[PDB]
Design a protein around this ligand. Structure first.
Ligand SMILES: CCCCCCCCCCCCCCCCCC(=O)OCC(COC(=O)CCCCCCCCCCCCCCCCC)OC(=O)CCCCCCCCCCCCCCCCC
Ligand code: HEA
Ligand SMILES: CCCCC/C=C/C/C=C\C/C=C\C/C=C\CCCC(=O)O[C@H](COC(=O)CCCCCCCCCCCCCCCCC)COP(=O)(O)OCCN
Ligand SMILES: CCCCCC/C=C/CCCCCCCCCC(=O)O[C@H](COC(=O)CCCCCCCCCCCCCCC)COP(=O)(O)OC[C@@H](O)CO
Ligand SMILES: CCCCCCCCCCO[C@@H]1OC(CO)[C@@H](O[C@H]2O[C@H](CO)[C@@H](O)[C@H](O)[C@@H]2O)[C@@H](O)[C@H]1O
Ligand code: CUA
Ligand SMILES: [O-][O-]
Ligand SMILES: [Cu+2]
Ligand SMILES: [Mg+2]
Ligand code: NA
Ligand SMILES: [Zn+2]
Lengths: 84, 93, 43, 259, 144, 75, 46, 57, 514, 49, 104, 71, 227
């Protein structure tokens, strides 16, 4: 492809800055919109103590040994289920 | 503006190589020397800053074997394989 | 290659001492552990 | 006195301190994992940071301040950097391999399907797409930086490099937040294992690449780069593109195709 | 004659079958009579004596081809020494058998082996070529 | 019925999916019949095949997990 | 700058051959002995 | 900010015999001493820990 | 002065000497581990204890010989000493990073000793397969200390390989093309490109083992959906290249030793030697699942890996025939280095050919995990890699130290080693065909005869090992200084004298383009 | 002038060989090593059941 | 090129009147690399070059290398000396055997 | 007077003579091997099975008392 | 089983094991020939005073010594891969037996009809009966009908093991979570022995396999009796 624009006389700083502010940062701002939109809590599913999940062959080396490193009580159940 | 150039800011050996290249000279051996005809009257002239330097002779184009020998200050020496003549031209930089 | 004669010649006798002492340095510690395996094995 | 263009380096203690630091960080992870103590590890992390700090300081002394980087030196360092990035690519390769192996033939324990039963993947169109555009944007703003530097423009070099850094940072913050929000964890079988380990080593590289861009920002502030000689900047721009490209493969493989 | 370590970068003398004319003479300094000999050498060589011819040879070269190529008795020392040390190894194995190795298992006792051999024959271990093939089940003995 | 026959869907040395598939089929079949009130004995072929193929500890663990509500396959 | 030449480009002294013997003996000797002492360690442990 | 590269070049090219890792002056010596002391001390500590873990507790 | 020179080195010859001392000391460790193996095996019944301690010894034996003796000697030792001299370069490209490749090795070795001191050791095999290597069948620190040792040794070689590739590519005289570097330099570059690409795969795989052991991942644990056979693929994707890394610098030394003692100015068929090493290095990445033919692989997969594996015989045979052709017509010097080379040619050939037998996956069902594989790989490693090292060691010892060995004693050591290794490993073919398994502390009684003799051979090799140490002492103790060396015109590394000065090629060589 | 090998080679060879043969014959036959040779032709099979 | 052209090149080489000591050595050292024993006419020309260079010893060494190059073909060296005998006589070159230089 | 001997390509001559001898020897050993090892083996297996009676082998084994499952 | 001083393979017990024997003879003859050619050439190169030390032309001889080996590899691969695909053709087993490896013993399940399964452990040396083989005997052998095609399925319940019986030419790894398949047909009744062939911890040396091959009718009664 060629995407759908033009220039190519030279590739100098002016061009790449034109692309930074005219294409790249706008896209980031559109994706930031779209995300800060589909964000906010989706509903936690019923806990089922599946044996292929919540693995523990050895206690983790921090906390009480049973919590993952970025444990989020809202959405990460422990092997025996979601926390108090 | 606001970014130094090499002309303004390069220093030490890097500046030395840059200035010399400007004058078309090669005190740091970046370039490969071109062979003379290699006869007794037209020997390859081998600069050095001492009174001997190791030469490697690639006798024929594409040989993979290089022939290595110390060239000493004095009468021209010949490659022990093809006899092309070499002569040391000592001292300086 | 050619070389010079030894600066510090090592006589047959001195080579015997160097060899004997070399072999003992390998054989003795190991021989001591293995000789005592039994007391290790069962203690 | 030499008459070649190569750099004879002064005897240095950083190779030994770097090695001892690797021993203290490995011994230290062992002690953390099995003997419930973090002390050796914290010592090894500290000597490691001091070693990298002084070693790279000294490379800056040798080049910017002492002029040892002749073209032939600089050409070697370009090779060193390409080769290093090649070896990081192969390292990511073994993790992509792991991921395709488990996802392509999901075993009975997972339900015989991918994603496993009980796994609810992130939507690749929400924060993962946003991360994707952040890192693609940062590859455009760093190319602007690089052209500014070559055209001798100090101020636009600094503004583009700053924008590039802020985007690295934003990616890192987005990803930390996603890690906290994700309903699956590293212990959720081979799905959380492949997800967190692959994307986690990528995040570590984004942190390292961002640190290197920040070293470049401060060296540029101090006028170290010329419009023609700026290897540290080039190397950090290659590494940065390497980080963006590994993200694109992770996004396509893990977030989009593995969802 | 006297070769010096500080001469390494300079052409040197060597006796080699395949490099018969080395880069320098074996002797380069000459006494008064050796100087006269080199002058005589500029006149007909027929007027040189056998002794003179030998001395000119010996100034140019160190050893002749017959000398440099001679074989030695070194092989007797290498083979006899290797044997001596291989013999010394058996002493190590004797000590290990005496001090380290305990009794072997009871299954190598002679009567166990006889019973075990019968049983392998009854189960026809390797009956095509390896083992039972060598037993004669008709004459009840090992095939001759 | 002597043993499970060659099945061209699982021609290779690794027979793990042959076992799992027949275990699934049998229990999906058992369910469909007992749902629509009717005859479980049509399901017999799959039960024979998975019994022939499948390690006893795997059957037993899969049975235990279907009882427990944690069997990850779809029945 | 450093000493150059035979016997000088090495981290151990060869000035005296019997001192050298002792040092070589401890050197190669320790390497060889170590697995024997680690086995013994493991045996004497449980 | 101003360009003071030239002053640093003068400093690091001073013909005083010092290796580059110490050429910045006395702060180099301190940081060196801190690094080397943490490396050597933490190595002795790793050996101690090895000794400790080598026996049952 | 001592500390600056030896702990803060930035010189390629001195760091090369450090590697040579470290690899020789590891060699003594590895020899002791191997004598512990054969002492257990030299008599039926249990000598040391059950299989755990036995296979802790087996595991350490292999890790020490491979990572601590072979790769340091060949690549860090001979590579650092020789490569910059053979291309007339003043040092390596990254002389300080080179010193860190060295100093990563004692900590790596210390972690490996730690592993065998704590708990009950790692009795996993050097391939460290899970689940036996996992946190239930090998609970506690030993396997983690092992993985961390491998990570240090990995970083050491990946940084080494980047330094070698760069030095070789970037630091030749400007007139010298790649096709004017000696074959040893070609072998070190080839080996470094294999290191660069293979060790990061091993590092990803052992890192997954680490996380399975400590972070509750399940890459190799079927309970979370993982697969033990995945670890095997990642391991062997490094592991087959690893074995070409172990022999490639050997093929390079052999070519220089044969050429030199045949009185020749060059090896026969240079560009075919280059081709053969590059082909071998390429093919060595697409064959690894020949280490997996009993794991339950589809037939056409097995057919491809059998075929791709056999194809390596072609380039490898070009080399073998070109060494013969270098000997052809030579003025043969029967120096001890030449004997180690000639023994190499033959015994490596034997081991490459039992390798071809194994490549046949139908027969490998029966040969796999038996002593037939152990005889294969000791012919190529304890006869091949080791004889090249010994050949290169006696050849270049006078270059590195400035003193000569006693040639009679060095010929005696060769003879004793040659008998010991062949008595050790030749009968292992019979134990293999007859079915004796690998990794066993005891064996059915029928196997007793070949295991007794194999153990007696190992004691003969011990005797050679101790003799070598004495021989190296005698050389330093007598101090016969080198005066003259032949064939410098085609052996640049000798042209600065013995030992060369600390700084060489401070004025580079002159080479014309014409 | 005779060298080492001219003076001693014959004695080195003769006594190295003799010693090696003696000590290996003794090792092999006098100290209780179990070689486990084949029973073929040597063992008389005996009832075991 | 035929054998005859090979030989004639080597005859010409050593027959150059002002051949120097470097060229004499270069020619013999190159020639003995080949898988042949030099024809008597080539040896003749090198022996005569030894004479113009006033080097008796190298003439004797040239005869030694002819004997060496023939290896186990013991018939070659006597034939070559037979053929060189007028030249040996003319120049007063004694053979290695006449000088005792064949004794080990 | 002595006749002129052959003086050229003596190494090459020796080479060719022996390589052809090594070929001849190789064929001769192939011949011998595929007769004393390979055909011998095929004939051993064929001879063993030509009139092999497996029930009778079994009955001999059963009477000698070897089996857990057959007395 | 192996017997004392054995040099080669255990006698074949299945048609496929015999096929491996003849393919090994074909290959070993190639192996002995090439290695003896190399040793021969080496000694040829080293036994002459004749020299030829100048540059030698390579592009000619490299043809031969590249094509000849290629042809040899083909002469090896052809039978090698005929045997491979043979061992893979469809065959219709009469009977499926599972074996599960454990630390350190094997358990066997014959569940085509009834639930029959048992554990098979090495007979300890001090309990060997007169005549029995140290390390090789089990309390409960794997009885199987002779002259019939049996599908064997191999897995593990803890670490890797591997299930081998050399005389039948069998070795199938035992990997947890996986069910590997292999077929077994014995031409003869008798006792056939194997040993665990993947490192699996303290008693890896001590968990052997003994198959007891008998007529079908004896196998049927044995099975009934083991319920
Ligand atoms: C150490 C103890 C040896 C015990 C000997 C056997 C006892 C016989 C009892 C007396 C009773 C004999 C009657 C029974 C016949 C059994 C047939 C069979 O089942 O057949 C299966 C056997 C057949 O094996 C044999 O048929 C014995 C092989 C002997 C080959 C001789 C060359 C090696 C040199 C000799 C000593 C080894 C030291 C060098 C080893 C290094 C490698 C050569 O199984 C093998 O595969 C073992 C070999 C594996 C292959 C490696 C291949 C390449 C080797 C080297 C080539 C040398 C070339 C130059 C030839 C070189 C000339 C020296
Ligand atoms: C220096 C180390 C080294 C090298 C170079 C090799 C080289 C080869 N290896 Fe080996 N190998 C090992 C070390 C090495 N190996 C190790 C350590 C293992 C076991 C690992 C473990 O499990 O712990 C192993 C295992 C191993 C296996 C796995 C067996 C198993 O576990 O069941 C196989 C299978 O294909 C194999 C094949 C080969 C082949 C075909 C070659 C080829 O490269 C050989 C090519 C050479 C030649 C063939 C000889 C020269 C050629 C000629 C004279 C030409 C004419 C020849 C012919 C026409 C054939 N090797
Ligand atoms: C925000 C993006 C940045 C990520 C980086 C930061 C995280 C902490 C530090 C390590 C990062 C890099 C190493 C990657 C290794 C392991 C996993 C890290 C990825 C991660 O951060 O994963 C977390 C788990 O972390 C855990 O266990 C963490 C355990 C922390 C100990 C790390 C273990 C380190 C051991 C690794 C040794 C590496 C050997 C490499 C050798 C290199 C080659 C020689 C995910 O949290 P969770 O709660 O399970 O799920 C979230 C649910 N809400
Ligand atoms: C929380 C914060 C800490 C995070 C953890 C650890 C990470 C931090 C490491 C970040 C990397 C910083 C690297 C800074 C290097 C500065 C030195 C430099 O950039 O040096 C340049 C040379 O390049 C060179 O060596 C280039 C040297 C290349 C360095 C590449 C670094 C990648 C390092 C990886 C380390 C981890 C490995 C991955 C884990 C699997 C100097 O030359 P120029 O630039 O041409 O200047 C000269 C001109 O001025 C003359 O006109
Ligand atoms: C695998 C490689 C090893 C190969 C074989 C080693 C060969 C011989 C080693 C000699 O070793 C020694 O010999 C002893 C006896 O011969 C020992 O002394 C023991 O024996 C005594 C007498 O029997 C006592 O005097 C002592 O206290 C002592 O512990 C012992 O200490 C040891 O050093
Ligand atoms: Cu079970 Cu080895
Ligand atoms: O690995 O062969
Ligand atoms: Cu391999
Ligand atoms: Mg296996
Ligand atoms: Na034992
Ligand atoms: Zn030339």
């Amino acid at each position: 492809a060629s995407a759908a624009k033009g220039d190519h006389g030279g590739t100098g700083a002016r061009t790449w800055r034109f692309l930074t502010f005219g294409l790249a940062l706008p896209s980031v701002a559109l994706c930031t919109l779209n995300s800060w939109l589909h964000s906010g809590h989706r509903e936690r599913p019923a806990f089922i103590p599946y044996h292929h999940l919540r693995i523990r062959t050895k206690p983790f080396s921090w906390g009480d040994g049973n919590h993952t490193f970025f444990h989020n009580p809202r959405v990460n159940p422990l092997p025996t289920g979601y926390e108090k | 503006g606001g970014v130094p150039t090499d002309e303004e800011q390069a220093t030490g050996l890097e500046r030395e190589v840059m200035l010399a290249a400007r004058k078309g000279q090669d005190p740091y051996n970046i370039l490969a020397p071109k062979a003379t005809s290699g006869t007794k009257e037209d020997p390859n002239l081998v600069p050095s800053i001492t009174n001997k330097r190791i030469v490697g002779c690639i006798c024929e184009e594409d040989n993979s074997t290089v022939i290595w020998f110390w060239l000493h200050k004095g009468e021209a020496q010949r490659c022990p394989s093809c006899g092309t003549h070499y002569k040391l031209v000592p001292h300086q930089l | 290659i050619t070389a010079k004669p030894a600066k510090t010649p090592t006589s047959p006798k001195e080579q015997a001492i160097g060899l004997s002492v070399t072999f003992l340095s390998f054989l003795l510690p190991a021989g001591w552990v293995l000789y005592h395996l039994d007391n290790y094995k069962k203690s | 006195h030499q008459t070649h263009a190569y750099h004879m380096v002064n005897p240095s203690p950083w190779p030994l301190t770097g090695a001892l630091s690797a021993l203290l960080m490995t011994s230290g992870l062992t002690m953390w994992f099995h003997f419930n103590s973090m002390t050796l590890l914290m010592i090894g992390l500290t000597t490691n940071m001091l070693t990298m700090y002084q070693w790279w300081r000294d490379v800056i002394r040798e080049s910017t301040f002492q002029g040892h980087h002749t073209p032939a030196v600089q050409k070697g360092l370009r090779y060193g950097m390409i080769l290093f990035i090649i070896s990081e690519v192969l390292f990511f390769t073994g993790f992509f391999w792991a991921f395709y192996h488990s996802s392509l033939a999901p075993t009975p324990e997972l339900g015989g399907c991918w994603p496993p039963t009980g796994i609810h993947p992130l939507n690749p169109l929400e924060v993962p797409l946003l991360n994707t555009s952040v890192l693609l944007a940062s590859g455009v703003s760093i190319t602007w930086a690089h052209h500014s530097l070559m055209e001798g423009d100090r101020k636009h070099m600094l503004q583009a490099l700053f924008i590039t850094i802020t985007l690295g940072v934003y990616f890192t913050l987005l990803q930390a937040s996603e890690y906290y929000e994700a309903p699956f964890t590293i212990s959720d079988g081979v799905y959380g294992s492949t997800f967190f380990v692959a994307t986690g080593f990528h995040g570590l590289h984004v942190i390292i690449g961002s640190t290197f861009l920040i070293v470049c920002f401060f060296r540029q502030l101090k006028f170290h780069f010329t419009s023609n000689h700026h290897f540290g900047f080039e190397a950090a721009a290659w590494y940065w593109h390497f980080v963006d490209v590994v993200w694109l493969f992770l996004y396509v493989s893990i977030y989009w195709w593995g969802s | 004659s006297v070769v010096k370590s500080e001469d390494y970068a300079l052409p040197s003398y060597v006796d080699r079958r395949d490099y018969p004319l080395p880069d320098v003479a074996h002797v380069k300094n000459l006494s008064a009579s050796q100087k006269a000999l080199k002058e005589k050498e500029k006149a007909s060589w027929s007027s040189l004596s056998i002794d003179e011819k030998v001395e000119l040879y010996r100034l140019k070269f160190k050893e002749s081809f017959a000398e440099m190529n001679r074989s030695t008795n070194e092989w007797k020392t290498v083979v006899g020494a290797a044997m001596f040390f291989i013999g010394f190894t058996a002493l190590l194995l004797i000590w290990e058998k005496h001090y380290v190795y305990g009794p072997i298992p009871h299954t190598f006792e002679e009567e166990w082996v006889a019973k075990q051999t019968k049983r392998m024959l009854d189960m026809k271990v390797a009956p095509i070529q390896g083992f039972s093939a060598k037993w004669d089940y008709d004459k009840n003995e090992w095939k001759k | 019925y002597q043993t499970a026959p060659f099945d061209s869907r699982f021609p290779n040395q690794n027979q793990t999916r042959n076992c799992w598939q027949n275990y699934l089929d049998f229990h999906r079949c058992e369910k469909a019949m007992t749902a629509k009130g009717g005859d479980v004995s049509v399901c017999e072929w799959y039960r024979r095949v998975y019994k022939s193929l499948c390690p006893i500890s795997w059957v037993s663990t899969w049975d235990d997990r279907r009882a427990e509500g944690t069997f990850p396959g779809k029945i | 700058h450093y000493e150059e030449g035979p016997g000088k480009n090495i981290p151990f002294s060869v000035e005296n051959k019997w001192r050298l013997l002792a040092m070589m003996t401890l050197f190669f000797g320790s390497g060889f002995a170590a697995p024997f002492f680690i086995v013994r360690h493991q045996l004497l442990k449980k | 900010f101003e360009n003071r590269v030239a002053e640093k070049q003068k400093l690091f090219q001073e013909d005083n015999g010092l290796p580059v890792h110490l050429k910045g002056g006395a702060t180099d010596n301190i940081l060196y001493r801190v690094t080397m002391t943490l490396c050597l001390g933490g190595t002795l500590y790793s050996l101690y820990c090895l000794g400790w873990a080598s026996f049952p507790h | 002065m001592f500390i600056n020179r030896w702990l803060f080195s930035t010189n390629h010859k001195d760091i090369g000497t450090l590697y040579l001392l470290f690899g020789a000391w590891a060699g003594m460790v590895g020899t002791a581990l191997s004598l512990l193996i054969r002492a257990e095996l030299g008599q039926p019944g249990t000598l040391l204890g059950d299989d755990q301690i036995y296979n802790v010894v087996v595991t350490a034996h292999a890790f020490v010989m491979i990572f601590f003796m072979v790769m340091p000697i060949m690549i860090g030792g001979f590579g650092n000493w020789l490569v910059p001299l053979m291309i007339g370069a003043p040092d390596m490209a990254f002389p300080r990073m080179n010193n860190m490749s060295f100093w990563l090795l004692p900590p790596s070795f210390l972690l490996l000793l730690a592993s065998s001191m704590v708990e009950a050791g790692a009795g996993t095999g050097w391939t460290v397969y899970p689940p036996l290597a996992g946190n239930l069948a090998h609970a506690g620190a030993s396997v983690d200390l092992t993985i961390f040792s491998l990570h240090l040794a990995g970083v050491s070689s990946i940084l080494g390989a980047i330094n070698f590739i760069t030095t070789i590519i970037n630091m030749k005289p400007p007139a010298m093309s790649q096709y004017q570097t000696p074959l040893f330099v070609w072998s070190v570059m080839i080996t470094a490109v294999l290191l660069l690409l293979s060790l990061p795969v091993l590092a990803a795989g052992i890192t997954m083992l680490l996380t399975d052991r400590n972070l509750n991942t399940t890459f190799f644990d079927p309970a979370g959906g993982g697969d033990p056979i995945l670890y095997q693929h990642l391991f062997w994707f490094f592991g087959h290249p690893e074995v070409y890394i172990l022999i490639l610098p050997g093929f390079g030394m052999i070519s220089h030793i044969v050429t030199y003692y045949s009185g020749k100015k060059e090896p026969f068929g240079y560009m075919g030697m280059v081709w053969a090493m590059m082909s071998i290095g390429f093919l060595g990445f697409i064959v690894w699942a020949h280490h997996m033919f009993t794991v339950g692989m589809d037939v056409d997969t097995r057919a491809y890996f059998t075929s791709a594996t056999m194809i390596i015989a072609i380039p490898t045979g070009v080399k073998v025939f070109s060494w013969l052709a270098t000997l052809h017509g030579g003025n043969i010097k029967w120096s001890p280095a030449m004997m180690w080379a000639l023994g190499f040619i033959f015994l490596f050939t034997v081991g490459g050919l039992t390798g071809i037998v194994l490549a046949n996956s139908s027969l490998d069902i029966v040969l796999h995990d038996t002593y037939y594989v152990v005889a294969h790989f000791h012919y190529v490693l304890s006869m091949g890699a080791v004889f090249a090292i010994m050949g290169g060691f006696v050849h270049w010892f006078p270059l590195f130290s400035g003193y000569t060995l006693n040639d009679t004693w060095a010929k005696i050591h060769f003879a004793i080693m040659f008998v010991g290794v062949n008595m050790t490993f030749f009968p292992q073919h019979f134990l293999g065909l007859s079915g004796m398994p690998r990794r066993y502390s005891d064996y059915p009684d029928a196997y007793t005869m070949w295991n007794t003799i194999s153990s007696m051979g190992s004691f003969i090799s011990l005797t050679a090992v101790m003799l070598m140490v004495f021989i190296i002492w005698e050389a330093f103790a007598s101090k016969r200084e080198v005066l003259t060396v032949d064939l410098t015109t085609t052996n640049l590394e000798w042209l600065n004298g013995c030992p060369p000065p600390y700084h060489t090629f401070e004025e580079p060589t002159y080479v014309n383009l014409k | 002038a005779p060298d080492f090998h001219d003076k001693y080679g014959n004695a080195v060879l003769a006594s190295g060989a003799t010693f090696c043969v003696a000590v290996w014959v003794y090792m092999a036959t006098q100290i209780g090593i179990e070689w486990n040779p084949s029973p073929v032709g040597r063992v008389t099979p005996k009832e075991w059941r | 090129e035929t054998d005859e052209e090979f030989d004639a090149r080597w005859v010409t080489y050593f027959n150059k009147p002002d051949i120097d000591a470097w060229e004499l050595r270069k020619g013999m050292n190159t020639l003995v690399g080949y898988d042949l024993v030099p024809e008597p006419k080539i040896i003749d020309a090198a022996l005569r070059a030894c004479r113009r260079l006033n080097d008796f010893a190298s003439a004797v060494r040239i005869l030694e290398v002819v004997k060496d190059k023939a290896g186990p073909h013991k018939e070659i060296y006597p034939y070559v000396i037979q053929e060189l005998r007028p030249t040996l006589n003319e120049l007063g070159i004694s053979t290695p055997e006449e000088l005792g230089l064949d004794k080990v | 007077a002595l006749a002129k001997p052959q003086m050229r390509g003596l190494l090459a001559r020796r080479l060719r003579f022996h390589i052809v001898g090594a070929f001849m020897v190789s064929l001769g050993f192939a011949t011998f091997y595929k007769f004393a090892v390979a055909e011998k083996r095929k004939k051993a297996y064929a001879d063993f099975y030509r009139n092999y009676d497996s029930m009778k082998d079994f009955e001999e084994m059963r009477k000698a008392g070897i089996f857990q499952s057959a007395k | 089983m192996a017997y004392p001083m054995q040099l080669g393979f255990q006698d074949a017990t299945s048609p496929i094991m015999e096929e491996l024997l003849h393919f090994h003879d074909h290959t070993l003859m190639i192996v002995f020939l090439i290695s003896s050619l190399v040793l021969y050439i080496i000694s040829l190169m080293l036994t002459t005073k004749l020299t030829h030390t100048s540059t030698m032309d390579a592009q000619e001889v490299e043809t031969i010594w590249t094509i000849l080996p290629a042809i040899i590899l083909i002469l090896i691969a052809l039978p090698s891969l005929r045997i491979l695909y043979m061992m893979d053709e469809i065959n219709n087993p009469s009977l499926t037996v599972k074996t599960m490896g454990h630390q350190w013993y094997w358990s066997y399940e014959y569940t085509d009809y009834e639930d029959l399964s048992f554990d098979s452990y090495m007979i300890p040396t001090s309990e060997l009966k007169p005549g029995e083989l140290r390390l090789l005997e089990v309390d409960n052998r794997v009885v199987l009908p002779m002259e019939m095609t049996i599908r064997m399925l191999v897995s593990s319940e803890d670490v890797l093991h591997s299930w081998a019986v050399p005389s039948l030419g069998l070795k199938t790894d035992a990997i947890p979570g996986r069910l590997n398949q292999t077929t077994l047909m014995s031409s003869r009744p008798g006792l056939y022995y194997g040993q665990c062939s993947e490192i699996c911890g303290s008693n890896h040396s001590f968990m052997p396999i003994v198959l007891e091959l008998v007529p079908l009718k004896y196998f049927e009664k044995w099975s009934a009796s083991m319920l």
